[PDB]
């Protein structure tokens, strides 16, 4: 497994047959295993694209790995999804797991569907980053923080309080799956594509203000495209 040496203002791969002493490992604290946000590769954050990035496969049992300090993740996800018979889907997070330290917009999902597989699997082999443990599998509850890890040889309340967007799912683990944003006990908006958490945040311009606000015993679910809001377009 390669590590990058920082030298002459660039990274250098460590899997070489010569150990030049221009760089010295004076201590173990020059070593790093830092996590990276997958999103930093320009990777889409759409909740449907996230589903598209996961394998939804039963398989060889999951593993996690300890990893180092690193960049904030703008988008991350939480999951409550269950199989159509109401059975649990995807293992619960292991003890001591907590959501990633800095996700700015954790997206949470709820509802049921086939939710194929037991261990999902990131299709890129990318690791979910839960707190300090990278993972090969999605865990229920805590924040996914998709990302990758690199090893290196070295020479304000919003930091945790930021987070928006929770939604229902219809079906799961397949690209027929639907996701609906929910605010003020109103389920709405399939999320189309290309919607930032902030785009969705802007939809709260309708909460107790611009339209929406069902007048009935419960929510009516508008179908997203006022055109976007899809007011009175719940069927």
């Amino acid at each position, epitope marked *: 497994i390669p590590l990058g040496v920082i030298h002459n203002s660039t990274l250098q791969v460590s899997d070489v047959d010569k150990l030049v002493c221009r760089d010295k490992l004076s201590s173990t604290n020059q070593l790093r295993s830092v996590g990276l946000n997958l999103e930093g590769n320009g990777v889409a954050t759409d909740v449907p694209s996230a589903t598209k990035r996961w394998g939804f496969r039963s398989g060889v049992p999951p593993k996690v790995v300890n990893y180092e300090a690193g960049e904030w993740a703008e988008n991350c996800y939480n999951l409550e999804i269950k199989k159509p018979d109401g059975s649990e889907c995807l293992p619960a997070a292991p003890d001591g797991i907590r959501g990633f330290p800095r996700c700015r917009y954790v997206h949470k999902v709820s509802g049921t569907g086939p939710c194929a597989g037991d261990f999902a699997f990131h299709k890129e082999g990318a690791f979910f980053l839960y707190d300090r443990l990278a993972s090969t599998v999605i865990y229920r509850g805590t924040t996914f923080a998709e990302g990758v890890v690199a090893f290196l040889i070295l020479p304000p309340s919003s930091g945790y309080y930021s987070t928006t967007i929770r939604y229902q799912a219809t079906g799961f683990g397949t690209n027929e799956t639907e996701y609906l944003f929910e605010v003020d006990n109103l389920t709405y908006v399939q999320l189309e594509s290309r919607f930032t958490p902030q785009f969705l945040l802007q939809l709260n311009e309708t909460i107790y203000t611009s339209g929406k606000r069902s*007048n009935t015993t419960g929510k009516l679910i508008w179908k997203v495209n006022r055109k976007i809001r899809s007011e009175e377009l719940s069927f």
Partner: nanobody
Amino acid sequence: DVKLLESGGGLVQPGGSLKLSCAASGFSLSTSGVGVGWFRQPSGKGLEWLALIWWDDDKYYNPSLKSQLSISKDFSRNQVFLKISNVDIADTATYYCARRDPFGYDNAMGYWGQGTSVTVS
């Protein structure tokens, strides 16, 4: 067009308990916002509310009966259920399952199950 189907108890002793169920043979109930529910009409009485169930995982009960009533569902089989603690003569009624009919705007549920009844003795 949904073949919502009734299920429930036959004649039972009073002071017992009864589980009731239904299913949507004509529909998956997979659309988000599908709502189904229960009501009853004892003695030719109007539509007493019993319960509301959403496939969005929302449940509601008629508070007067809620203390002895529980809602359950099974999406894999398009099922909805009620469990009634303490069934007695006051609970004898005709019963129906119901579904949104205009569907998704102003409730409108509206659509009915076959109709069933429960009696005690």
